[PDB]
């Protein structure tokens, strides 16, 4: 988070938190309630988001292992979509990409290459999920949510 | 029903049914026996029509809600197909599209938009059902069925 | 424009504009610089918006008449996208959806059904165009542009 980043920056220089860093931390603590409301909206609507986004993703990217007749593959893909929607909600709670990066961006390419799942298909699915999510968010809330989708997409692109 | 059509036509003019309307009524009531046979054919082959039409429709449109690995959605779509075959059988019995229009056409777009089922896919499925149903009757029996399937397809587009 | 709407509303009652109408008129003319700026942004970036929206839309809908190997169909689709951006710019200038509605929304379903362009595909293309266009607008400017894109999308579906 930004709190952790500021504390680490202050610690490196063996100094207390400067007034500017404290002002930044205070601003994010003020915005915490709004971020919590946005994340609650994301969590309460995650099932519709995943349903619509998965239908769109199988329409646009049909040649994918989840869309291959295997029930297990389809179930795992849907579980992963729900997992990433929830992770984006939690990282919205925090206010920075650090939790989502630590849980599901660092090493995501290696994990899905070991699983033999194309990462471009994942990029397409995240794009569809982002579109569906943006459909049900205000522009102001989208300004908070979309960059995490973009961070995930960038971390997934080979 | 064509009988209701004749009665309401006479009523709009506040006159008794004219001899032409009586002639139409007599022809319809004497073709009712063939209409019952067509309705029985549709009823007894409903599952075959539904399965074959679903196979063809998923060949054309595989990425559809009824073919997304959700068993409930598949069951609901195939039940809808059976229901429309049922309504077309009703219309064959009644001699007009009024049963089909009143039960499954008025507000069909609104209902399927609320269900988030794209209407193009439903039109394609109706076309496949129409072909499957026509492959089970002679052309004379199939005139009415083709007309009613076209009516359903036009209501969705 | 909205001025025409106020004038016609006053004329319907055969009376001079009421204080509420004059207040609406003044509020509208107060925002002329902002409307002109938004229209300038839309006009300058029309081709970039068209290109980005086309790329996204062909990613989302691979089997569409635009993306079917016919260069004329692709050119016509991109011209349609540009024309709709132009109509949205007109609407932003006029303060109401009247230009867009009168030029490219009334009879849009009939025109695109005659051209055999599926309407769901056009709705998706409009969604991609809206996402590309709103990225160039500040938060103050995006309200009317998003509303008019939504107006087109609702007219199509």
């Amino acid at each position: 988070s930004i709190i952790t980043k500021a504390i680490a920056s202050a610690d490196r220089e063996a100094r207390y938190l400067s007034p500017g860093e404290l002002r930044t931390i205070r601003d994010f603590y003020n915005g915490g309630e709004n971020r919590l409301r946005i994340a609650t909206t994301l969590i309460e609507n995650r099932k519709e988001i995943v349903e619509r986004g998965s239908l769109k993703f199988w329409e646009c990217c049909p040649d994918t292992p989840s869309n291959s007749g295997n029930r297990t593959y389809r179930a795992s893909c849907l579980r992963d979509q729900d997992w990433y929607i929830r992770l984006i909600a939690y990282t919205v709670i925090v206010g920075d990409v650090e939790p989502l990066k630590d849980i599901g961006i660092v090493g995501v390419k290696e994990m899905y290459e070991s699983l033999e799942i194309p990462l471009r298909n994942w990029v397409e699915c995240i794009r569809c999920l982002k579109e569906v999510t943006l459909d049900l968010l205000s522009r102001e809330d989208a300004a908070e949510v979309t960059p995490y989708f973009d961070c995930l997409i960038q971390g997934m692109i080979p | 029903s064509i009988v209701t059509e004749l009665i309401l036509n006479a009523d709009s003019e506040s006159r008794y049914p004219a001899p032409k309307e009586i002639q139409v009524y007599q022809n319809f009531v004497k073709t009712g026996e063939q209409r019952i046979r067509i309705a029985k054919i549709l009823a007894e082959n409903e599952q075959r029509i539904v399965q074959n039409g679903s196979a063809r429709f998923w060949e054309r449109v595989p990425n559809t809600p009824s073919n997304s690995g959700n068993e409930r959605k598949t069951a609901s779509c195939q039940r809808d197909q059976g229901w429309y075959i049922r309504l077309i059988a009703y219309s064959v019995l009644a001699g007009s599209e009024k049963p089909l229009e009143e039960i499954g056409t008025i507000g069909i777009k609104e209902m399927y938009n609320n269900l988030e089922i794209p209407l193009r896919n439903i039109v394609e499925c109706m076309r496949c059902l129409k072909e499957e149903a026509l492959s089970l009757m002679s052309e004379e029996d199939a005139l009415e069925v083709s007309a009613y399937f076209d009516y359903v397809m036009r209501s969705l587009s | 424009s909205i001025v025409t709407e106020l004038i016609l509303n006053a004329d319907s009652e055969s009376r001079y504009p009421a204080p509420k109408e004059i207040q609406v008129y003044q509020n509208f003319v107060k925002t002329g610089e902002q409307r002109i700026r938004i229209a300038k942004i839309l006009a300058e970036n029309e081709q970039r918006i068209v290109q980005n929206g086309s790329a996204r839309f062909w990613e989302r809908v691979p089997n569409t008449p635009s993306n079917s190997g016919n260069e004329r169909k692709t050119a016509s689709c991109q011209r349609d996208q540009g024309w709709y951006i132009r109509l949205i710019a007109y609407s932003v200038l006029a303060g109401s959806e009247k230009p867009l509605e009168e030029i490219g929304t009334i009879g849009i379903k009939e025109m695109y059904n005659n051209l055999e362009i599926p309407l769901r595909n056009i709705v998706e293309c409009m969604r991609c165009l809206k996402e590309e266009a709103l990225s160039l607008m500040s938060e103050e400017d995006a309200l009317e542009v998003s509303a008019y894109f939504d107006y087109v999308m609702r007219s199509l579906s």
Binding site: E59, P62, T64, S68, G69, R74 | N63, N67 | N63, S68
Partner: peptide, 26 residues
């Protein structure tokens, strides 16, 4: 307990008709 081969049992009818195909293919 040096043997674990009994726990490595790894982890049917297709759930989709006509898989891995695009809609409205010419």
């Amino acid at each position: 307990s040096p043997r674990h081969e009994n726990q490595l049992r790894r982890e049917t009818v297709p759930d989709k008709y006509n898989p891995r195909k695009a809609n409205w293919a010419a």
